[PDB]
Every structure is written in structure tokens, then in C-alpha cells.
Ligand binder design. Structure first.
Ligand SMILES: CS(=O)(=O)CCCn1c(Cn2c(=O)n(C3CC3)c3ccncc32)cc2cnccc21
Ligand SMILES: [Cl-]
Ligand SMILES: [Cl-]
Ligand SMILES: [Cl-]
Lengths: 441, 441, 441
């Protein structure tokens, strides 16, 4: 879609809009199972060697489940427990008879829904029947001939089928029974798509999930659960996207300082509310660590667990940081160091002191030299930006940028009553302290 | 065991107790080795192809060792060097004759203790003898028949044996010779258990380590060391648990704010001493980043390298934050944003402003609507908590919660002399500033 | 080379010098390709089974590219976009005919340079020709005999060749098309070395990169790009080391507090400018998160994207923190907790309160007991340091340490006007506040 950007010279910040939301709001828990089997010449020795790998993988996973499974403004977030729902389901599976309900449900099929004893309705999947393979092809060789008649084409095939159990067990072993993202050994591409289609969700969610399998995997958990009655079962916890196609925008901020000659006499100010914003249910979901969100074209995948829910008036800070309805968050300092923030469609440059700051093009080199202050350049005709010894490549996606001129608000502050070293502050709090200092003077 | 929780309404915090400690206090360094060998039709070409994979894995690891191997209150921690002990041992192995001492010690066995030249006594393990396999089965095929007589069952078997060397080399290649956790290619489940049993430790440590192999792996390092005289050797650095079965408890904290109508007029306070606490040697080991500790049932595995050693009186902050023996750490602000902290046995809810905050059950939906302030609900009968647009699942483990009523201490502060934006502060420091402001007035 | 260390008792800090730089300053983008092919008894069924794995890997990667690819003083850094350059190249490859230019260029060879339509000159590599293998050996079996004549030695060989495609696809599936470090499936050791040799760089850069392949891998990206016209192509983004062999030094800092008896009456100060420093182009490249830099012997690999460019006078803070040319950064507090910082050649110990702080040797145990204050011990004759319940191993590399005596500067401050809880501050700012407090008194 249309991605557009606006740079606010007055506050050294830029907003990228045109994105659409896909917010993980909930969890779907599915129970994936693998049916187990309970149990010389060159080719048989390889079968016994592979069968040993199988026996020890089972013993390994049994040992691993002795315990129940577990695992600027970011400091404002709450603290969730990401696998609480999957662990709850996995707890129900240890209740007696519960494992047998699943074993029975998938006797004649590989996909089935099971209502568990506490009422939970979960999709169930038998992805590998080692029970049947071992019990139909390897058992005859090991007992009827007394380890005599065998062919190497079954050795090859057994290694293939056993490999996935060996890899699932490897992942759980280096991860204490909880893995994320969910690999293709836990759930192949075909199985996951099939799982998504049989999921009880909207057609929009199914299309969205199927066209972004790779993101679904990164937002999912595999929780190793139980081995009981020749059934190996792990819970796969999949994201529920309850907010889809609402507007999102990305706020980029950079330090705004005065540019006086005498070093140390300068005051700085930085908008601290940078991160991803998405309209959500009459409020705005604010993600202060924009690295928690994944962007695919103009779709942005975030997790509400790493969000604050803010009044929509928080948007007014971009056009009017002095607006009377939301108290815009800033931090203050006297550290006027140079840096750049690469935005979606351009680059913000905070250039101070003796720093060389330029913007270049691929074939012609330097096309703009920044003066001291906070400035911006759009990615049209620019390929790189240089601040000091640091070269930044700019994003080269299509979209129009608008440069909104305005006097930098740092000019409105008297440096001799300016409160420096304020981090979790706001426009009004800074004024509150300035008036108190001006009172005592 | 018995997990229990107490919520302190006065300070918006909760303590989970009943846990027992397993603290990594030291390191055991073992030297794992792989003995190397020094060195047409369809089946021989595959042997030569696999032999090439072997030769290049050796060349790769030789190239990789040109250099010596290397790798709220968290800011208070010191700075260790995690693989210093393994690197020290690995340095000793480059001394002349040192590699030959090991090669000799494991001539007749695969497990042996070797006292190295500087006095260090290390367990040694030969986990794969490629020297013997290549030198007994592949060498005859490549020289005696001139690449003639071969059978595919050896091609299969060679790929199996060579695979682990290829994978060990892959791990070291993407990790610059230092890996953690220690995979099952570095050390299989059988080898690690055997290593633990032959370790010079208590019977309690052996049982504890064997029943938590997956945690031992996550707290271990594999340091690629030396290739010399047909011997490949890497050091595996294993945790020493010198503190076991002492009481541990988890402190959860959340922001406590006043709830006045006029927005911006509110003051907030948050206990900053959240994290894991374990009794340790007459003091308390405090782990400010509770994500450094791993919980398995009621056992909690932590690393003393990420701890502060505090006076045990730090515990008094939970029952009496104004106690005269320890100066309880807090932070102050005026940012009254809503959030929840999911505890071990319930959920703390900091609900402010216009936020919808509720607690729900699986089948009946909303059972409690929180008013503004800091409140708590136990996981008995509750499955989810909702703060704004964020849905939290609560932990569903058994254990009793006690709600300790008390007036929120934020009510005891006059907002017009309240010092906001204090981060590394304490009860006494805040009083010190309030009295100084009250003096100048 | 010569690694040396100096400890400044006056400021509780230590500098390690003698290192030489290797700074990633730019990016080289190469286009790696795999040529694809467009498409019963026991041995044929395995071929059809492996061929299915191939078809689905292709379908998987096609689904994955529906979207364009994306991915104390650290807070002062700017914000780059690491794969912007590779993504830009990958965008050019979707232009029509562009894929065919590459397909043509590597018809007769596997390595070739191609000037793309926008002028970019990129190295191109065909690392696997599955097109030819499938189209010469498997096609005859599946069509001419009608799935009759086949031998197991080709089944083995097909699994080998197809395996790398299956693994590349696995990596991209768990990583949303962008991986780092660059595995040996993306680019084998031989291919990467060959790529480095054909790179348009200096002989120094080629030697440096070839002798540190493992670091090059960790600083590289694999960006999954396009599948078009039987050509699979991903961009490998390799580091350009434009700064080599300049001096580097590592600054370690630890809290310096007064040691009065009455607890709570103490004031602390910590130099905040700790991290890696490298001379670079007349300025100094400062890396505040020293964990972004990788050290190999005396060579230190850093990324300028995680640096500030500072005046070289920042070095004066080590010999004279009160120097008049650079305003040295510090933080203040009243939290006198004990801890240690393990340096390159010794250990800084900040010992306060009732903490037991000692230094030990391997065979003789405790050789020094620290008194309260900030002290230092060199790694000559010392193996471990203990602060409270935390045991630290010291680095055991050769190099001389010098202990520079001096009165701790915290003694020069009157505790009753000392501004505590200052984080982004400096020597002059603290004096500025002290004089303002002394004025109002
Ligand atoms: C991107 S950052 O959050 O990591 C950098 C913050 C560091 N910092 C501090 C100290 N401080 C923290 O470290 N936290 C974080 C971990 C809980 C705070 C939360 C609330 N108030 C102060 C906090 C003061 C200060 C003043 N100016 C600039 C930076 C400053
Ligand atoms: Cl870049
Ligand atoms: Cl949750
Ligand atoms: Cl250590």
C-alpha cells in the first residue's frame, strides 16, 4: 500500500504511516502427537544402530519431562507468562485417561478435535506413526528371521522416518522442552497450513496466517508435554490475531540540541515515545521496542504482550507537542552527540559539535552536507548517510516524504533553568520544574 | 513442594516462596576429544565424497583456532568473563607434550583423569575414534584394491560416524569456536550423564545434575581448543552447583500510583528490587534479571555471576518497606500507565486512567472488574487477566495466595514536594529530598 | 602483540591497550544462486519421496517471498537498518530480465561479476546445479523405464545434493528469510574463501577476512531474495572492513564509593564511558556495548553502526578525569553495593559494606583480602576473585599491568550537596549542581 512519512523539524521526529495491523491478542493450543512403538549381518547392524537412536531419544524425552515446563519506554511494560496457556493444557494431559482420549480420537484419522476434561476444545494431530512403521516392517526382520533377512532400502527409509524424532528431541534438549520459533521438525509447512485451515478462526485470519507462515512460526511455541502409552505429545501454541487491518504508524525520534559554540553549554531534548503505534479498539496499542514488531511489506505483526494501551490523543504529540490533551513524553540532557536514525522513507540526522554529517548517492557521492542541528533527508535520490565514522544505508522503498518546517522547540528553553538528566519526563513536568526554578530566583 | 504467595497491597508487590536453590557457583572443565586419521565406481565415489567432507572439516577447525577463544537493577551487576576457566585450561593444552599426555591416557580406555602440567586435574573423554574407523575399514578399500571392492553398507556407516564431526564443526563455525548451550553433538545424553557420574562432586550434585540434564546443558559451554597429533579436543565447561536446597523466593513489583481525576496530577512509586532471591551463606543472593534463572517445578537454577550479595535484612522490605534495618529501593515517577504483572500464583494489576482492567474465567468470562489502583487476584478460579488491549494468561499451578491488606504507601506523600523521575533511589533518599524541599518552603 | 593494562585508583577504572582494529564500515552484497529443475519399486519410491522434499522446499521458499525482507551509554546510539543495502539489491533482482542476466552470466562458469541495471556491480555465484543433476540422472529413471531401473547409489547421492537445499530452506523458514550468522549451508567455507578472494578489496582485507572466516560469518547476513526462471537466489551481505590496524583500547569502570560506617551516608560515582575505543580517522570510535565487539587475540572486530564518533580528547579522561578539554561522563548514586569487573589482565573490585572480597590462587587459596573501597589485582599469580557469594575467574593471558596510585575522587565531594541519582551526567554538570546547591545555602 501507500507508505508515507512526515518529518517534524520542530521536534526532531518522523512518523511513517500507511501500515496495517496484525496483532497477536490470544493463543490457540494444539496437541501434536507422534505414536511410538514399544520394544548379525551388516544391514541388520545398521537397523539395530538406528533403533538404538530411537530408544535413547525416547528415554531422553522421558528424562526431560521430570519437571513442568517453564521459560526508551520498555521499562513501562507489564510482565506476562507467555506459555501459561500451553502449560495449562499440558497439565491437563497428565490427568488419567486424558492421553487415552487422544489416542482413541486419532485411531482412524490424523486430524481430530478433542474436548478435554476441563472443557478445553483443542485440535489434535498425529504427524508421525512410528508405532506402525516399526511394528510392521522392522519387527518382522528382528524376530522372524533372527536378524537375517533385510534389505538396505528399508535401512534408508527407517533413517528417514526416525530422523524427525531425533531432531525434535535435539531441539527440546538444547531448549529445556520449550522452543520458539516452531521449526519445520515440530510442524512441517504442510502440517501447519493444514492446522491453520482446520483452526476455528475467520477466513481473514486463515488467509493472513497462511500467507505469513514464517511470522506465525516466530510467534509460536512448541512445549514438550508428555510421553505416555506409546504416545509422544507436545503442545504447539499458535498466535491468535484478534486485531487485523487497523492503521499502524512508526514514530522515529532523535536528539534535538542547541548548537552553541562553547561546548558544554548546550541543552538537549528527545521525544521518548518512539516505537510502533496501532489503532486498537478505540485506544492505541503502543509498542516501545519496535524490534518486537515484524514488518512484511505494509503489514506489521506485533504482540500485545509488549504493548501499552494509550489514549488515542497520544497521536497529537506529532503535530503539536504542546497540545493540551496529552502530556507528551520527552527526556532531557546536555549530551549533544551526533547520530542518525534511519526511518522507513528517509533519515533523521542529529548533527552536533565537530561531526561531519552528509548524505550521498550511489554514483555521485556527497549531495548534501548537514549543518549542526536536527535535519532530515528522504530516501529519494539518497542511498547512504554518514554521521562521523558511521555509514548508514537508507531504506529504498517507494513512498513520499513530507518535510514539515518548524522552529526546534529546544530554542524555547532558557538553558540556565533547564532541567537536564530527566528520563521518564514530559512537556508539562519539565515546565513544572522550570517554573519552580524561576520561582526560587 | 508447597508454593505460596503473598500480595502486599501497601506496596503493590508479591512474593512467591517455597522454591529451593540450585546456584551455579563454579565451573568444571573437561577435555572432550575425537581421534582423527591422517590421510572409480559409484560406491567408492561416495566414500571419496564423504572423505572430502571429513578432510575439509579438519581444515576448517584448524583455520578456526588461529586465535585464542573469547566471547530494574541489572545495571548494578559486576562483569565476569564466563569462559575464563575453560580458556585457561585450553591454553595449557597447547604446551608441548600436553596433548600427548591425553592421547596416551585414553589409549586403552575412553574415560580418564589427567593431571595437566600446571596441576589441574581434568576428566578426559574420547567420544569418537575416527582414526580407528578410517584406519581399519576405509584405508583397505582405497589402497589395496585401488578403489575397487566396496559395499554400500559401509558408505551408510561412514556417513553416520562422520556426521557428528561435520555437525560439531558446523556449530563451531557459526559460533566462533564457543557454543552454549552444549548440544548433543558436543556431548550426547549418555556421555554427559556418564561424565556427571565420574565427576568429583557430591551424590546430591550428581542426582541434581542427572535429573536436570537440559538445564546443565544450558549453563555449559563448549570451547573449541586444539587439533594436534591426530587429536581433536574441545573443552566442555560444566556448572558447579555449590549452593543447593536453600530457600528461594521471587519478588514481583508493579507501579503504585495515586488515582486522582485530573490527569497529570498523580504520583507513582515502584519497588525496584524485583527478581529472584535465594538464601546463600548467611547473605541473600539477589538476581535482578529473573530471566537469568530457570525454574523447574519448585527448583530454581541461577548463576551467581548475575547476582548481588545482599544482607538478609533485604527481606524486611516485603513486610515493612519503612523498616529501619534495610533502606528499601524504589523508583518514582508521574507516569500512571496501566499494566499487569503475572506472578507465580496470581496477577498484580496496576490500573489507572481510563483503562479497562478485568479478570476472567475460561467458561464464564468476566468475574472481576478492577477499580483504579494496584490490586491482585489469585489464579484459583481465574484464567486470564485483561489490562487495556493486552490479554494475559495466568499461571495455573497449585498453591495458596494470601492477600495482605494495607494502605498504599503512595498516599503518605505530598504530591507538591514529591520527587518524580528518581530511578536508583530508596525510601530514605526520597524522604531526604522531601525534607529538603519542605525546608526551602 | 603486547597487551598492557593500567588501573586508575582515583577513578576505579582500567584501560587495556595493545589491540588493533577491524571495524565493519560498509557492506558487500553478493548474489548466491542455486539452479532449479522444473518437473513402483523400493528404490524408486525413495527417489519420489526425496523428490517430494525438493518440490515442497521450492513451494515453501516461493511462499516465503510474498513480502519484501525486513528485520551504560548504549541509549546514545543512532538507529540503522542493517540489511538496507542487501534488500536494495534484492529489489533490483525482481525487475524483469534482471534474473535472466545472471542466469546467462553463469551459464559457462560458477563465479561471475554482473553489472545490474541500476549500475551496481555484484559478484555472482552458482553454488549448486540441481537443474543439471535432476535433469541428467533422475529424469531418465522416472520417464524412460516408467519408474523401473534404478540403483541405490543414486538415492544416496540425491539425498546428499538435495540436503543443502532442504537446510537452506529450514534456516529461512525459522528466520523469515533473513539469517545471521551466515551458516555453511548458505555458503561453505570453500565458497566463502573463494568469494573473499574474488572480492574487490585490498590484499590486507583479503588476508584479514580469510584468517577470520568465523567472524566474517557472524557479521554477515543471508537475505532470501527471489525464485524465478528455475533460479533460486539469495543475497549474502558481507562486511567491509574499511578501518584496519588502528589502536584500540578497552575501558573498564566500576563504582567508586565512600566507605563510611553509618550505612546510607555514602556517596558513589561511576565512570559511564566504559566500552571499546578505536582510533578512527582523526576521531575515536566509541562502542558503549563492548559485547558488540569480538576479540580474536589482539584483534578486535566491531561494527561502526553501534558506535559514537567522539573527539580523541575523550582519552584524557583516563589520566585526568578533571581535564579541561573533554567533560568526562559519570553517574552518581548512593547505592554502595559490592561487585567486581574482570578486565583483560586483572580484576577491579568495588568492595563496600559487610562484603567479603578476596583474590585467590589455584593451589594456595586466599592471597589477598580487599578492604572497603575500589581496588585492583592483576592476573599474574591470581586465578579467581570473590565478591560476596560470586566467584569470578580472571582472564589468564600474558601482559603487564600497572597500578597507578591516586586519591579516589569521591573524597573530593561534600556528601550533603552531592547530587545522587544522576545517570547521563558529567564532571562539569555535577559541579554545576553542587555550586547551585552551595549558592542556595
Ligand atoms: C533505553 S534505556 O531505558 O535502557 C536508557 C535509560 C537509562 N537512563 C537512566 C536510568 N534508567 C534506566 O536504566 N531505566 C531502565 C531499565 C529500567 C530507567 C527507567 C526509568 N527511569 C530511569 C531509568 C536515567 C537516564 C537519563 N537520561 C538518559 C538515560 C537514562
Ligand atoms: Cl547499513
Ligand atoms: Cl499470555
Ligand atoms: Cl567465571
Amino acid at each position: 500500500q501507500n507508505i508515507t512519512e512526515e518529518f517534524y523539524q520542530s521536534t526532531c521526529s518522523a512518523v511513517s504511516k500507511g501500515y496495517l495491523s496484525a496483532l497477536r491478542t490470544g493463543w490457540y493450543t494444539s496437541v501434536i502427537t507422534i505414536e511410538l512403538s514399544n520394544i548379525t549381518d551388516a544391514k541388520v547392524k545398521l537397523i539395530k544402530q538406528e533403533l538404538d537412536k530411537y530408544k535413547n531419544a525416547v528415554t531422553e524425552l522421558q528424562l526431560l519431562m521430570q519437571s513442568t515446563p517453564a521459560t526508551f519506554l520498555g521499562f513501562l511494560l507489564g510482565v506476562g507468562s507467555a506459555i501459561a496457556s500451553g502449560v495449562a493444557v499440558c497439565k491437563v494431559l497428565h490427568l488419567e485417561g486424558e492421553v487415552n482420549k487422544i489416542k482413541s480420537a486419532l485411531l482412524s484419522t490424523n486430524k481430530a478435535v478433542v474436548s478435554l476434561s476441563n472443557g478445553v476444545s483443542v485440535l489434535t494431530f498425529k504427524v508421525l506413526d512410528l508405532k506402525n512403521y516399526i511394528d510392521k516392517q522392522l519387527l518382522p526382520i528382528l524376530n522372524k528371521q533372527s536378524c537375517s533377512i533385510s534389505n538396505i532400502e528399508t535401512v534408508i527409509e527407517f533413517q528417514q522416518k526416525n530422523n524427525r524424532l531425533l531432531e525434535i528431541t535435539r531441539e527440546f534438549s538444547v531448549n529445556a522442552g520449550v522452543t520458539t520459533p516452531v521449526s519445520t521438525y515440530m510442524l512441517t509447512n504442510s502440517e501447519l497450513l493444514s492446522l491453520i485451515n482446520d483452526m476455528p478462526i475467520t477466513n481473514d485470519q486463515k488467509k493472513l496466517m497462511s500467507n505469513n507462515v514464517q511470522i506465525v512460526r516466530q510467534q509460536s511455541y512448541s512445549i514438550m508435554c508428555i510421553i505416555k502409552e506409546e504416545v509422544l505429545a507436545y503442545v504447539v501454541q499458535l498466535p491468535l490475531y484478534g486485531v487485523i487491518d487497523t492503521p499502524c504508524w512508526k514514530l522515529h525520534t532523535s536528539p534535538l540540541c542547541t548548537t552553541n559554540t562553547k561546548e558544554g553549554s548546550n541543552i538537549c531534548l528527545t521525544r521518548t515515545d518512539r516505537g510502533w503505534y496501532c489503532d486498537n479498539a478505540g485506544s492505541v496499542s503502543f509498542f516501545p521496542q519496535a524490534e518486537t514488531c515484524k514488518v512484511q511489506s505494509n503489514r506489521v505483526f506485533c504482540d500485545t504482550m509488549n504493548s501499552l494501551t494509550l489514549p488515542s490523543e497520544v497521536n497529537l504529540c506529532n503535530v503539536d507537542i504542546f497540545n493540551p490533551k496529552y502530556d507528551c513524553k520527552i527526556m532531557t540532557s546536555k549530551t549533544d552527540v551526533s547520530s542518525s536514525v534511519i526511518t522507513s522513507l528517509g533519515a533523521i540526522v542529529s548533527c552536533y559539535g565537530k561531526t561531519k554529517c552528509t548524505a550521498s548517492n550511489k554514483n555521485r557521492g556527497i549531495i548534501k552536507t548537514f549543518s549542526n542541528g536536527c535535519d532530515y533527508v528522504s530516501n529519494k535520490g539518497v542511498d547512504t548517510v554518514s554521521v562521523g565514522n558511521t555509514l548508514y544505508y537508507v531504506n529504498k522503498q517507494e513512498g513520499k516524504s513530507l518535510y514539515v518546517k518548524g522552529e526546534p522547540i529546544i530554542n524555547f528553553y532558557d538553558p540556565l533553568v533547564f532541567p537536564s538528566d530527566e528520563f521518564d519526563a514530559s512537556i508539562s513536568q519539565v515546565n513544572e520544574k522550570i517554573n519552580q526554578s524561576l520561582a526560587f530566583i
